[model samples]
Target: KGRDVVLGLLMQKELSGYDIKIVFEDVFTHFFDGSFGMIYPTLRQLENEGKIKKEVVKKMYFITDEGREEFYQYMQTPVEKDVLRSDFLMRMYFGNYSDDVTIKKWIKDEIERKEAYIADLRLKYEKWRVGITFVEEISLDVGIASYSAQVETLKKKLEELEAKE
Candidate 1:
């Protein structure tokens, strides 16, 4: 996944490691949040494999023709499974073990986080609307809507828990 992301970015333009990190934070925050720990190693591996090459002057990485072909092959491959790792969900699964106060606190924290993320998505969507394709615009819409749904569900759950108190 990380390699695919790097290759995809390289397809757009050559970028240094630091620049790629910035792009990940600004652009790919919701989808694939690539961290330096994973990215640096993946870059090295891709370079070693002849999938990508690092420029001597700028420390920038560019995809080779082979890399572009590999990336294309990867794109055609069907997605295997839903990769979801949510600490919030895990906490809620075992929330019964925790006391009421702790659970409520967790719910509150999640609500704030979701709300902030939705707001961030909205801002990005507004800026990207004019520049991007319909598919990209709709993808952002889905992200916003999904997070909004999560926030609403969390709010309802919090209310239910509070009403019992």
Candidate 2:
């Protein structure tokens, strides 16, 4: 609540501003809003308070043990967060505002994005799946194999959308 929770977490690992933002944006954005305005100041305060030590390697911050301890302590306390919302989805939700073709385009784009991601995951899994044949497999089915298991579910959803059409 006070300062550098994001930085402290990063101190647990090293990161650049852009890298930190990506992790927050892609992963934590739905739950936690850590903006540059907030993160930069908190990082400075953490350094001043001796709660965190920063090493500027090419203008990046690295966390010290003190920061790690602070993060551990803070992790025990309750933290407030905002709920996730998607601007794109919000726009789509009010579908009457847009024409059918545009709406279909948006749906198509979203589906394609997910499809590409699924394809990439499948390829990665395929490589891993074969590797498992030569070496020991990972404890869980993974890569594409895990995705292969999910393809049916995805197809089910796509079929439902088509039925609506």
Candidate 3:
């Protein structure tokens, strides 16, 4: 997944390890997350595989011809399965075991958390919107939409739960 992420980002433009990390945090925060340790190692592996090349100045990485081919090939392949692992959602799934008050409190807390995340993501979108490409803008928009939707969903659920009291 890391390799595919790096390749896909490089397909857009050249970037340093630092830039990649920033992209991961800002653009792909909802779907993907990466740290320097994971990124650098992935970069090294891609470089060794001749899938990418690095510039000397700031050590920027660019997708090679081979890398582009591989990316395209990967894109053509269908997903075998969709698997998600979310601790929050997992807990929520089993939350029925708890009492009403506890569940309501948990819903309120999750709504707060989701709102905070949306606020932070908005700040990032505002800061970076002018500088990114149209596609990149769309990606950020999707993230904002996703978080916004989550907030709305949680709010609705909370309201429903509250009305039951």
Considering every candidate listed, which one attains the maximal lDDT?
Answer: 1
As for candidate 2, its clashing pairs are: 125-144
Each candidate: RMSD = 2.0, 7.1, 2.6
Regions of model 3 farther than 4 Å from truth: 33-36, 79-82, 160-165
lDDT of 2 by residue, 12-81 (tens): 4677767766655443432355565566677677668776556667556677677777778877778656
Give the residue spans of candidate 2 off by over 4 A. 1-32, 35-38, 56-66, 79-82, 116-165
Q: How many backbone clashes does candidate 1 have?
A: 0
Computed on alpha carbons, the lDDT of every model, listed in order, comes to 0.87, 0.59, 0.81
Kindly report which residue pairs in candidate 1 clash with one another. Answer: none
Model 1 Cα shift for residue 5 (angstroms): 1.4
Q: Point out the worst 10-residue segment of candidate 1 by lDDT.
A: 31-40
Best by TM-score: 1
- lDDT of each residue in 15-85, candidate 3, tens digit only: 98888888776667676655556666889889999999988877899899999998998889887574557
